[PDB]
From a paper:
haptoglobin forms a stable complex with a haemoglobin dimer. Trypanosomes take up this HpHb complex but not the individual components.
P3121 with one complex in the asymmetric unit. as a search model, allowing a poly-alanine model of TbHpHbR to be built. binds to the heads of HpHb, where its two constituent components come together. from the membrane distal tip of the receptor and directly contact haemoglobin. interacting as far as 70 Å from the membrane distal tip. dimer with no contacts between the receptor and the haemoglobin α-subunit. why the receptor binds HpHb but not haptoglobin alone. haemoglobin that is formed by helices C and F of the β-subunit. residues K56, S59, K164, R199 and Y200 of the receptor. their C-termini, can simultaneously bind to one HpHb dimer.
Author numbering:
A (entry chain A): 2 to 142
B (entry chain D): 38 to 297
C (entry chain B): 3 to 143
D (entry chain C): 148 to 153, 171 to 406
Write the structure that this text describes.
Amino acid sequence: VLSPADKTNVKAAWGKVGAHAGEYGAEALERMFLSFPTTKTYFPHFDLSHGSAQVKGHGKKVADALTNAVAHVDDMPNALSALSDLHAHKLRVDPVNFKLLSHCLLVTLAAHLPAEFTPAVHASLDKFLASVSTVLTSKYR
Amino acid sequence: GLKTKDEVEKACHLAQQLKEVSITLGVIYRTTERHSVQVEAHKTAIDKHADAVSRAVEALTRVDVALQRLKELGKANDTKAVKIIENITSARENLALFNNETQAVLTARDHVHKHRAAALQGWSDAKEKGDAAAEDVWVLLNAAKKGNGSADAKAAAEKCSRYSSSSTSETELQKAIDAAANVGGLSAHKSKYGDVLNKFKLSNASVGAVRDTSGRGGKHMEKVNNVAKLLKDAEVSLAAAAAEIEEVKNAHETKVQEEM
Amino acid sequence: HLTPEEKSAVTALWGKVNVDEVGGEALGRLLVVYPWTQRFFESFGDLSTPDAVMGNPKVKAHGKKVLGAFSDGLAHLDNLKGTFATLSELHCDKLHVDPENFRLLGNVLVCVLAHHFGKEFTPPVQAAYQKVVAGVANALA
Amino acid sequence: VCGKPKGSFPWQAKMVSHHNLTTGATLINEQWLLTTAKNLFLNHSENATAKDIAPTLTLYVGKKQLVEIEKVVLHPNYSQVDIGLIKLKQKVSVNERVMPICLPSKDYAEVGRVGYVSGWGRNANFKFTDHLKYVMLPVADQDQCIRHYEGSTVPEKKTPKSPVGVQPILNEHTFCAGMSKYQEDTCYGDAGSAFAVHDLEEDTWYATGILSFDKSCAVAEYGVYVKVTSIQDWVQKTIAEN
Ligand code: HEM
Ligand code: HEM
Ligand SMILES: *[C@@H]1O[C@H](CO)[C@@H](O)[C@H](O)[C@H]1NC(C)=O
Ligand SMILES: *[C@@H]1O[C@H](CO)[C@@H](O)[C@H](O)[C@H]1NC(C)=O
């Protein structure tokens, strides 16, 4: 559950990210692929080399989705319905992977927005990404 | 310093038991969480009961305010009023029981928290003291690995683990302290050892009090649940009684007006 | 297993860590982000707010001890099992700590390193630290 | 015989689907377990029968003790009451690690009641837990829970409000439970596990509910459980007949 205080923390931290969201998304994927090689199996036809344009493109889509969730924190399931069917039913992404990407996004934010990444903000963002991860996996069977 | 195998073994055992104090107590303390959860659940249930019985309570209050007016008119001896009062006396008795048992539950809840806070503080003090005393013993044990002192003393010091093989107790800690009384270097810290043992006993006893208090609370809560249901079940007949006595009171008001 | 190149990037980074602070900050954050961990540490006194947690002397002190054990692990990457056998016996057999919490602390530590090192905490250095935290978690389990 | 644990949840079983998804089941006598209909249908077509399902399941109790299944019985109204029964080919041997939980005579699904829910579900890292864990949870107010997932207790005012994007089955046959003091919840694979209540007068443990909605994961606020008292007669008849 995101409290009003969490929502404020998320909106502020993501407001600082601003236009860097695509770059941060691409770096979180890059960190995920390199730290947890098993994730690469979901992208057999991607160029996953450092600086791949295909990864920068995907990082931008992932970031846009998160931006959209931040904009609609009170109605996240609805905002993410198409994505939730995509990930759970069509792609069948095991829930573990969402925790890997969530960790890598937090690492990316900590490295890029040190001023903003206080303990309370870290708790709020972990909770936000846990809500996104749950919405995207609740249909998995 | 520790120069014999015997001194090293007595010091080793003591250091382990002092270090074990915080570990054993954390485990014991964590058994009180179920009681904190239970007593918080009692409070929520009491709030729900209080809400559920409020209509029955409101009817009983309406009955008393109609009766007070009948007393003012000198008509409280009206046979219908008397009959209504007799009919509602079980509910009046049940309301007094509900008030008393809920208060007993809430006092037990306060006592659980108070004993838990003492157990926590006891654990924290025991750890502060225990870890420090174990560190002072380790100064001697570490020094005993080198220099003078027998090869057997050094080997025993090299073998000494930081941790006890099992959980400690008042008996085991006391046994370790008493054995170490014979050891020169350790003897300087005897009062420190005593305070650690008293904090262990205090924490442990507070945990026992949490458990006993929580049991008493649960018995009171069962009575609360039973009497709350009896009051809710009487709600409709209590509302009927409040209207009847209000009618009686209204007829006596109009009889007084018409008689002036 | 760490390439010698990875062992190198890791110890290179570690050499720059404020040994007196990052331990308390990683433990402090574990307690704020994953509050159920507090039940092992309620003996630390006031943990009621993130500032109370982060500023608590007992959190700081205990943090130093945890970090110290990670430092020992770094000196023995080849034998983490043997190095952590006594500690595993404490956490496992005496404390009954769910082994998932070791991974959470490790991950919080990675976040702290990212927080303090920024850009220097590159994806390849993260990947090497992920091997270390997993290795330390498995050895503690 | 039942509900006297020496190790802490000897009634807990672990079910594994043909596609390696872990779920829960609960031992209710020496030869029968309760679980959910959703658990049973994992990796099956919505048109599968009990006969199709049964030979595709793997079940363990105690310290990895594989037990062979004879058959499965789906609740006749499983879209309303998310339940199934599992019959073993033979009785389990009861000991300190394997023992049934008692079925209750009283309705312990009241606010003011605290239950222990053990489970093999996914943990904080979304990995199926290696070690059995449990949560202590309080029974929550039914209306609070209904409003959380459905917006209103009034049928014409209901809307799908579930914070996780999937709706639980909520009705007169179910109860809700909250989240732990330390905000721990149930998650994927925990369904089929018992909401166990300790009757202090008898000093016995009872299955008050079977976890149905195991998708809250500390995102939605409540787990939803099938009330054992509401299926007790059906359970007894089924066991007596098979
Ligand atoms: C915060 C978590 C995540 C978000 C917000 C997210 C978002 C999305 C988005 C927006 C798309 C593009 C839909 C489109 O093609 O138009 C998608 C596709 C995809 N996602 Fe996810 N995703 C997440 C996590 C996962 C994870 C953890 C994996 C696997 C490890 C996964 C694997 C995929 C794959 C394989 C595709 C399809 C690639 C393609 O054909 O374009 N993502 N992602
Ligand atoms: C994975 C990295 C971890 C490391 C390197 C680590 C390190 C250690 C060390 C070195 C000590 C021993 C200090 C002493 O008493 O002599 C210890 C004690 C302890 N640790 Fe850990 N630990 C880790 C994770 C955990 C986690 C996840 C928890 C539980 C949430 C845990 C809870 C404890 C407790 C309760 C103590 C005992 C303090 C006492 O009462 O004596 N730590 N830590
Ligand atoms: C997963 O299930 C398949 C059979 O459907 C098979 O690979 C194996 O039995 C399971 N995998 C593991 C690692 O146990
Ligand atoms: C199944 O549903 C119908 C609904 O009216 C009910 O009459 C019947 O008794 C239910 N069966 C069981 C076993 O609950």
